[PDB]
Structure formats: structure tokens, C-alpha cells
Design a protein around this ligand. Structure first.
Ligand SMILES: NC(=O)CSCC(=O)Nc1ccc(F)cc1
Lengths: 237, 300
């Protein structure tokens, strides 16, 4: 069934699984028309499909052309998501296909279930966790490839950089969700934290700065401060 | 007119005949039901006074033979049997009529209820759903499961209803996933109507046959089947105009006939609200929507 705080370590066992997040698939700006009406203009989007054990991120870029001439785009976006995840599974060798796919929003369950009827053994599951993957577009290098795309495109990343050389995937996921939760609550402060010290750089083949173990403890504590704070500034406490 | 005689009534029982019902006391001198309209299927059903558990009964058509009821004290129920000796059967029936030990099928002459509930039900087609080829009549009871319920355990005692599943490869054409799931016309018209039922008469017949099993025996899988068959039509954008008009009439009489006090369990809130207010056919079921709103506005 659903995924929650009680079966949390299942994410790091040896059964291949993928999270799918569709919150950045259909993206728009809203603006006024010359006549003083409101209209939307879509911008490029992305499906965020992540192996939480290995860090492999399958970033499928959703080019605005896929919306041209279409109606009910927010509903289509869920089915376009399910179509692309199905295509990805089919493209993988059998021993690499996931045994479970966990959607971050329950609205994706039926679209994905229907697109995956051919895989009756792949479990499609929801989750009670409030994961912060919507903040993926606050990672500069992911935002850059999405915005520059002129056609549909899949790009592969490791969202954990080289962290698994030093820490476990349980800890790597905890760090990732803490970074992303911070970027979501206050993007400016979050980024200021990550990049303040100009002597810690991001390697060309990485997404995050090359922090030492000790520097990560400092970073992590600063991100928790930010999240409690904003939660005060938000809730006045 | 035809007659279903009873050898006797050794146990206290409520007897149903179509939408009518009457109480028979233990060892009361009851020898059957007369004046049954020829030309319609019929169902004769039973609920023991001592065990309201297990409603059970027999679908039959008088044109297909001389049938009677006889209590079996080993198996503990009223059984339908066929008498092959025609002279023996007229002789028995005539003697019981002369002594006036039979109840009369009590049809008001204005009343088309039973016809309206059974328009497309067929006895030969029914024999395929409740498989028992050695008898011309068919037994059903409250506990019998459906083939799809068995997929989700005795197949000889199962209700072989047409299996409808909206998230199945049968329902969904590769490459039309979103289209076919949101507009089920392909599944309704090509898969089900053209290529399995063969025509809408067979489709309405099973839908009619499902409902009656749900109402008269509280058979849960039948209720599931009735609602599924409604939902498939309601969730199709492209339905023949004549089918919509007939469906409205079919459902209207089913809703009219349902016991007011069984609504909580025989009606699925989600399917009905979908069908009457959200679906493609929300504005196509005028009679059904009107009786539903005036009789069960709580469900909506
Ligand atoms: N391929 C087949 O033979 C199944 S075609 C379904 C069908 O004819 N169902 C039906 C069930 C009960 C009725 F009273 C009337 C019709």
C-alpha cells in the first residue's frame, strides 16, 4: 500500500524502486493580455524520477511543444508523465526495471497504473510522506538543462554526487531531502548557505558543493536552523 | 396461465414469486402458485422463518417445462424439479386447484412492473451464467460468488457474469491509455457490444439479471456487476441514442421497485453520483435522475 514513516527503511533495501514526482511537468507563467485579460504561457518542465538507493536521477525534460493544441493540460500532464515513465521502464533491461514505483501525488496512481498494465508485477504505490522534490528546479544545473532544452530530452544525473563513497543511502537521502526542504521554504537563504564560502566549489560533474564531512555537518545544521526559523517567521513563534 | 405446484410445505417459509411475497406456516396446507403469466421468465424464492440466512430461489420459464417444488429434508430446502409426465402433472395441478390450495399470482392489470424489469432477460442465456445444464431452471442464492470475485472458490456454483474491468488490457488500447480510460466508448461499443454481448439486448439482459439477483437475494457480486454495467455506459461519450433512452427506462423501474429500506446497501453512492452528475451521460437519464432525487436524495 502507501509509504510512510513506518516503512521508511524499505527505500534502501535491495529491491529496485523509483520515486516519480510530476510537480514540475506542466509549468506556466500567468500574465495580463493587452485587453486586460489573463493568459498563461507554458515553460519547459521535467519529470523527476529518482532511485533513492543509488541516487540515479532520470530527468525527462518536457518541452513546451508537447502542449501545443492540447486541452485540459493539467490532466494531460499526469498522463504524459505516466507515458514517459512507462517508456523509461520499457527501455531498461529487465534486471534494471523497478519492482515498485512510488508516486509523490495520489493523482498519478491511475494514470501510471493504466500505462503499466503490461507490467502487472510492478507495484504502483502512493506515499504519506510530504517529500520536497518540487524544489528540484532550485538546483541550478537541473534548472539550466530544463530551460535551455529546445526539444524533448532525457538527462541522467546522480543527485547524491559522490556521497555514497562516504555515507549510506539512508543518510544520503536524509541529506537530500533536508537540502530540498530548505530550498523549498526559503530558496534565497538556502542557496546563500550552500555557496557563501567561495572556497568550496561544485565540481563540473556534480550538482552540490564539495563539502568535507565536517563542512556538511555545519551545512546540515544551518539548513535545520533555516527551516525552524522560516517556520517561526511563518507561524510567529 | 401456468402453475407451479408444491408437494407440501413442511417448514415455515416466506415465499417470493417475482416481486410478490407471502408467508406460509409450518405444515400449512399449501400446494403452490397458479395463474402465472406465460411469456416472461419468473423467479420463485425462499427465506426460511428459522434462518433468514440464505435467501435462495429458482429462475424458470413456464414455456420450457412443467416445474414443481418439493421440500428435501436431507438438504433442508425447497427444490425445484421437472415433471416429465405431462398427464401426471395436469392431473396433480387440477386436483390442487379444485381444492383451492394455491395462491394466485396477483397481477394488477394496469401493472407492467415485471415486464419492465425483465424485458431482455432470457432463460437460455441465464443457463450459461448459472451453469447446471441438466436442469431447465437455474438456482441462485445470497452467497454465490461471481467469476471475477473468484479471480480477486467453487466454479460450479459461481455466477459467470461478463467480467468488466476498467483497468485491464481488454479495456485499454495500447497508445490510447488516457483516451480510453476517460472515455470508455471503445470498451463499451467495440469490445463489449460488438464483440461479446453481440447486441444491446443481451447487454441490458445481464444488467437486468444482475439487479434482480442483487435485490431478491442480496447477492453482493450481482450488485457489483449491475453497477459496473451502468458505469461503463455512463462513462462513454458515444452511446447509441436508443440505448440511452432504454437505459433510462430500465433504471427507472429498478429504482422504483427497490425497497426503500435496502437503499443503503444496494446502491453505490459513487457510481450514481458519477452517472447522474459527472459523467458524459449526466443529462441523458431524465427519468432515472428524477426518481432518484425524489426517492433517495440522501444518497446524493
Ligand atoms: N458470449 C456469451 O454467450 C455471453 S453474452 C451475455 C449475455 O447474453 N448475457 C445475458 C445474461 C442474462 C440474461 F438474462 C440475458 C443475457
Amino acid at each position: 500500500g502507501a509509504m510512510n514513516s513506518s516503512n521508511y527503511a524499505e527505500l534502501f533495501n535491495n529491491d529496485i524502486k523509483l520515486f516519480v514526482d510530476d510537480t514540475n511537468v506542466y509549468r506556466v507563467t500567468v500574465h495580463k493580455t493587452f485587453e486586460g485579460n489573463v493568459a498563461t504561457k507554458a515553460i519547459n518542465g521535467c519529470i523527476f524520477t529518482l532511485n533513492p538507493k543509488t541516487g540515479h536521477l532520470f530527468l525527462k525534460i518536457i518541452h513546451t511543444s508537447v502542449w501545443a493544441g492540447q486541452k485540459r493540460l493539467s490532466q494531460l500532464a499526469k498522463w504524459k508523465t505516466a507515458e514517459e515513465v512507462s517508456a523509461l521502464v520499457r527501455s531498461l533491461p529487465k534486471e534494471e526495471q523497478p519492482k515498485q514505483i512510488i508516486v509523490t501525488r495520489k493523482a498519478m496512481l491511475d494514470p501510471l497504473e493504466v500505462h503499466m498494465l503490461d507490467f502487472p508485477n510492478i507495484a504502483i504505490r502512493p506515499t504519506e510522506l510530504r517529500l520536497p522534490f518540487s524544489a528540484a528546479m532550485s538546483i541550478d544545473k537541473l534548472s539550466d538543462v530544463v530551460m535551455k532544452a529546445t526539444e524533448p530530452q532525457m538527462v541522467l544525473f546522480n543527485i547524491y554526487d559522490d556521497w555514497l563513497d562516504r555515507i549510506s543511502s539512508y543518510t544520503a537521502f536524509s541529506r537530500l531531502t533536508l537540502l530540498l526542504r530548505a530550498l523549498k521554504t526559503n530558496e534565497e537563504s538556502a542557496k546563500m548557505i550552500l555557496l557563501s564560502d567561495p572556497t568550496i566549489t561544485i565540481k563540473s560533474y556534480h550538482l552540490w558543493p564539495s563539502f568535507t564531512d565536517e563542512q556538511w555537518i555545519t551545512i546540515e545544521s544551518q539548513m535545520r536552523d533555516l527551516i525552524l526559523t522560516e517556520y517561526g517567521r511563518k507561524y510567529n513563534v | 396461465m401456468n402453475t407451479v405446484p408444491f408437494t407440501s410445505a413442511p417448514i415455515e417459509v416466506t415465499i417470493g414469486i417475482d416481486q410478490y411475497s407471502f408467508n406460509v406456516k409450518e405444515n400449512q396446507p399449501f400446494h403452490g402458485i397458479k395463474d402465472i403469466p406465460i411469456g416472461h421468465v419468473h423467479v420463485i424464492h425462499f427465506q426460511h422463518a428459522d434462518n433468514s440466512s440464505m435467501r435462495y430461489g429458482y429462475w424458470f420459464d413456464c414455456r420450457m417445462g412443467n416445474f414443481y417444488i418439493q421440500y428435501d429434508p436431507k438438504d433442508g430446502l425447497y427444490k425445484m424439479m421437472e415433471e416429465r409426465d405431462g398427464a401426471k402433472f395436469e392431473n396433480i395441478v387440477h386436483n390442487f386447484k379444485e381444492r383451492q390450495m394455491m395462491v394466485s399470482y396477483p397481477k394488477i392489470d394496469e401493472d407492467d412492473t415485471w415486464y419492465n424489469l425483465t424485458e431482455f432477460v432470457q432463460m437460455d442465456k441465464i443457463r450459461k451464467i448459472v451453469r447446471k445444464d441438466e436442469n431447465q431452471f437455474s438456482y441462485v442464492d445470497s452467497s454465490m460468488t461471481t467469476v471475477q470475485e473468484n479471480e480477486l472458490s467453487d466454479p460450479a456454483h459461481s455466477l459467470n457474469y461478463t467480467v468488466i474491468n476498467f483497468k485491464s488490457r481488454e479495456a485499454i488500447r495500447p497508445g490510447h491509455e488516457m483516451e480510453d480510460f476517460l472515455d470508455k466508448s471503445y470498451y463499451l461499443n467495440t469490445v463489449m457490444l460488438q464483440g461479446i454481448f453481440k447486441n444491446s439486448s443481451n447487454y441490458f439482459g445481464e444488467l437486468q439479471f444482475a439487479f434482480l439477483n442483487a435485490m431478491f437475494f442480496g447477492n453482493y457480486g450481482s450488485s457489483l456487476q449491475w453497477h459496473a454495467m451502468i458505469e461503463l455506459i455512463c462513462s462513454s461519450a458515444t452511446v447509441p441514442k436508443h440505448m440511452l433512452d432504454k437505459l433510462d427506462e430500465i433504471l427507472y423501474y429498478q429504482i422504483k421497485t427497490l425497497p426503500e429500506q435496502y437503499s443503503d446497501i444496494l446502491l453505490n453512492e459513487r457510481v450514481w453520483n458519477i452517472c447522474l452528475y459527472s459523467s458524459f451521460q449526466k443529462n441523458s437519464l431524465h427519468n432515472t435522475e428524477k426518481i432518484m432525487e425524489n426517492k433517495y436524495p440522501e444518497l446524493l
